[PDB]
Amino acid sequence: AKTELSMGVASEDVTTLDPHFATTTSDRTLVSYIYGALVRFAPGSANPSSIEADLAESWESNADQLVWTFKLRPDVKWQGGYGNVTADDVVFSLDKARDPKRSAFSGDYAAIQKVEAVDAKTVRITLTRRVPSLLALLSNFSGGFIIPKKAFKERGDDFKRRPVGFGPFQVESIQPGQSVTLTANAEYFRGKPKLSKISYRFLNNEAARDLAFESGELDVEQGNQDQRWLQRLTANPENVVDTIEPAELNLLHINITKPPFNDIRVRQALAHTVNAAQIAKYRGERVNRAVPSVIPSNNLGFDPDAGVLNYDPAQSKKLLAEAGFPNGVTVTMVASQLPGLESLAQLIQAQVAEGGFTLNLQPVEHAAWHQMIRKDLSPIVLYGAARFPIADYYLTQFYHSASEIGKPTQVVNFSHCNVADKQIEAARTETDPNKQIELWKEAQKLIVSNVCAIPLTENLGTWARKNKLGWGFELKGSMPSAPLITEQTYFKD
Ligand SMILES: O=C(O)CC[C@@H](NCC(=O)[C@H](O)[C@H](O)[C@@H](O)CO)C(=O)O
Ligand SMILES: OC[C@H]1O[C@H](O)[C@H](O)[C@@H](O)[C@@H]1O
Ligand SMILES: [Cl-]
């Protein structure tokens, strides 16, 4: 039986395999193969209702939902001889995850007061205030992944390149800018993987990646957001196409503090000459959808009536003239070379010329671009992402003033949005589902009318597999919008 899987992704390299820092789809995908968490999404699901036992066998909460106790499975062992997974490892991981100096996702854990190892198999988490979902924070995504205290202490700066998890796969070696070689974790607590090896290959160029998949060089390849790729790959009977939840929302985040965009009329002019409905139609409706708000449509608290500015390029030119620009505006955007983001920026560039904007694009490799946008190097940021499907996540990270670039608490608030802080904070601890949803909708209307960010389309993850490969479960979703490979993944006879 075939046991070695070859996979091709839209990425140039590994940046970090430390789960408290892994942000790009590619790093998050590799991290989902290496690590586990206290709780997890069911394999093949990106649905929170599927949150179930992983390292924690079970858990208990008190009535005020501030104290959560987790009972750890005793049979879970670390990769690379680091022995049994203990409560001390969980305390270390969660204390690191909630630390802004040692984590990119500390903001998610702001409500945590303390994490205690009651005994070797028992973890107690105490919250200062209520969170919409504590289990969400402790799931196998972002800062929820558990790392060994002793392995991080020993490896330090090398840990991001030599990761240690308790997941079904381990990193044997990294071939910088070429591939990651993963081998089966033979001691994986749910059983020995059916696959012996994963060759995870960096194949950014779409035409080259498609050739490699077509020839059989790859068993799995990442697709794009275009219906032609979808049609061509379905036409060959040896392939199966997977359209994966969650959909990642793409927005033009405008830095509201920088001229000419510190004038609301200029931001409104830009919002009126982008055509999200045309983007969805051009790309294809199965994978792509125009979003009538500034957060993905699958979110608890989503506002379908957020008041998104309509397509009116005549109004754009009228607004620009009122703002002192009768001959238009030139904007230079630092643009990611991730092919989907590059194609999207190219379609935006053609569209915004209708309303008087000359959009110049400075192409930069994706991971380097991620660092530049976090140093305020672009006046506008074309960013595509999904978060845990509760409005608090997307709203805090992208639009709360504490998340703005330049602060030690910075997340992904590229727009320097500061209009919905009170509504975001109030919704976070609001008990009843309806008035919590109303505060979230209030936040969305304020973010939209201030034109902090212009929503475009949201896209489901697109991947192709050869018929011979079975995921070992039905693939509907995966939090990174990329396939999950587990101990159940196998090749058919
Ligand atoms: O989690 C995050 O913060 C980053 C999200 C991660 N997603 C990839 C991405 O932006 C999307 O695929 C994107 O919607 C484009 O391909 C749009 O066509 C990235 O930048 O690699
Ligand atoms: O734009 C085309 C080029 O970009 C791609 O992302 C690859 O890095 C390179 O192999 C290719 O020739
Ligand atoms: Cl990348």
Side-chain angles (χ1 to χ4, degrees):
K2 177 183 181 66
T3 67
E4 307 179 340
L5 172 72
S6 277
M7 194 176 159
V9 305
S11 182
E12 293 292 359
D13 212 348
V14 190
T15 304
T16 175
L17 299 177
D18 177 334
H20 307 136
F21 292 103
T23 299
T24 69
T25 291
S26 189
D27 286 357
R28 290 183 187 268
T29 304
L30 286 157
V31 153
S32 81
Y33 301 175
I34 300 154
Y35 306 97
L38 288 164
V39 297
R40 67 173 193 167
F41 278 84
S45 182
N47 189 343
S49 72
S50 82
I51 288 164
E52 60 188 25
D54 195 13
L55 163 69
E57 239 153 25
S58 67
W59 60 89
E60 291 183 326
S61 66
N62 60 350
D64 69 12
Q65 303 279 91
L66 304 177
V67 185
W68 294 75
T69 309
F70 294 80
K71 279 162 196 178
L72 313 185
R73 283 187 67 126
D75 67 325
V76 189
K77 284 198 166 149
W78 286 118
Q79 288 150 11
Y82 286 96
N84 286 316
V85 181
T86 70
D88 280 351
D89 292 318
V90 177
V91 169
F92 174 83
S93 300
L94 298 178
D95 284 347
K96 186 180 177 290
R98 74 198 185 85
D99 183 1
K101 297 177 172 176
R102 299 184 296 145
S103 175
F105 317 122
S106 68
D108 288 349
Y109 304 85
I112 296 175
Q113 180 206 288
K114 57 181 179 184
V115 187
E116 301 172 298
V118 176
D119 62 43
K121 309 165 174 193
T122 317
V123 185
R124 189 195 290 124
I125 296 152
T126 299
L127 301 178
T128 293
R129 62 171 185 272
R130 285 172 113 117
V131 291
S133 181
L134 180 92
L135 295 180
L137 294 169
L138 309 175
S139 65
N140 62 318
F141 193 61
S142 300
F145 295 107
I146 308 306
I147 75 162
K149 183 177 180 182
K150 191 176 189 175
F152 196 83
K153 252 104 153 81
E154 283 177 13
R155 299 175 184 208
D157 290 336
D158 298 329
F159 189 87
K160 70 174 66 56
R161 292 181 293 272
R162 304 188 59 236
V164 185
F166 59 71
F169 300 94
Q170 67 209 328
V171 168
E172 179 179 84
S173 62
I174 301 175
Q175 289 70 234
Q178 302 290 145
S179 79
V180 177
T181 304
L182 301 98
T183 58
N185 170 11
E187 303 307 303
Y188 185 64
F189 75 94
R190 299 189 156 104
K192 188 196 183 187
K194 268 86 184 76
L195 297 179
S196 62
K197 287 180 88 172
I198 306 162
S199 182
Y200 186 98
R201 303 166 183 196
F202 298 118
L203 294 172
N204 203 57
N205 183 278
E206 286 180 359
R209 193 196 321 131
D210 283 343
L211 280 183
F213 182 82
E214 197 290 323
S215 75
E217 187 65 16
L218 307 173
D219 305 295
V220 173
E221 76 151 334
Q222 186 170 353
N224 69 21
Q225 297 72 48
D226 183 40
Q227 56 185 317
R228 282 169 56 197
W229 180 87
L230 208 62
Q231 290 155 3
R232 197 200 327 125
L233 269 86
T234 309
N236 198 315
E238 78 175 275
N239 314 321
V240 175
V241 175
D242 297 320
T243 286
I244 303 176
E245 285 178 1
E248 297 180 278
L249 175 63
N250 304 291
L251 296 114
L252 288 164
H253 299 270
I254 307 164
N255 190 334
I256 74 167
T257 73
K258 293 172 161 174
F261 292 104
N262 67 324
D263 184 342
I264 195 164
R265 289 171 303 191
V266 181
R267 304 201 297 272
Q268 291 164 331
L270 188 61
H272 285 301
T273 191
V274 143
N275 200 333
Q278 194 197 60
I279 296 162
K281 190 187 181 140
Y282 170 104
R283 286 186 149 188
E285 300 291 359
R286 177 184 169 187
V287 165
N288 315 271
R289 185 195 166 275
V291 182
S293 197
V294 287
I295 69 171
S297 72
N298 83 342
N299 282 234
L300 212 155
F302 175 74
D303 189 2
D305 315 292
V308 167
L309 273 63
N310 79 321
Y311 181 72
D312 191 354
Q315 217 208 107
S316 298
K317 284 162 134 78
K318 185 179 183 171
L319 286 161
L320 289 179
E322 289 168 14
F325 301 98
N327 307 318
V329 166
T330 299
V331 201
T332 304
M333 189 172 85
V334 188
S336 173
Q337 284 179 304
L338 176 67
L341 283 173
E342 178 172 85
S343 296
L344 185 52
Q346 179 202 38
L347 186 60
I348 295 151
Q349 174 186 64
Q351 285 187 349
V352 303
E354 201 66 52
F357 289 86
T358 300
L359 178 64
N360 292 332
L361 306 165
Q362 280 175 344
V364 177
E365 182 283 320
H366 188 60
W369 170 81
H370 266 275
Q371 307 175 242
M372 290 181 70
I373 61 180
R374 283 165 179 84
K375 286 303 181 169
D376 262 332
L377 288 171
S378 201
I380 302 167
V381 177
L382 173 62
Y383 206 89
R387 286 299 179 260
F388 196 92
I390 293 160
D392 178 55
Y393 282 87
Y394 223 86
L395 295 170
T396 300
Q397 296 182 35
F398 289 92
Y399 312 114
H400 193 282
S401 81
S403 299
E404 81 197 1
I405 306 308
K407 284 175 170 173
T409 53
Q410 74 173 45
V411 195
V412 281
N413 183 2
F414 302 113
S415 66
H416 294 249
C417 189
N418 67 345
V419 292
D421 291 1
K422 289 169 185 184
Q423 295 76 12
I424 292 159
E425 282 171 35
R428 212 179 275 156
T429 59
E430 190 62 69
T431 60
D432 170 78
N434 177 66
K435 44 230 211 82
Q436 179 178 55
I437 279 166
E438 226 45 51
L439 288 156
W440 280 325
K441 287 185 172 187
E442 279 175 44
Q444 283 161 87
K445 286 181 179 74
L446 291 161
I447 299 150
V448 168
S449 66
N450 224 251
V451 200
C452 288
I454 305 161
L456 310 165
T457 48
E458 67 183 4
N459 30 257
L460 294 166
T462 51
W463 297 77
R465 64 164 180 84
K466 296 294 177 189
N467 293 337
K468 197 191 166 75
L469 180 81
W471 301 121
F473 49 82
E474 183 197 352
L475 176 64
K476 291 194 159 291
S478 191
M479 273 315 305
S481 312
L484 178 69
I485 293 153
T486 74
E487 76 285 357
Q488 301 247 286
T489 311
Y490 75 106
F491 284 99
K492 293 151 199 173
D493 291 308

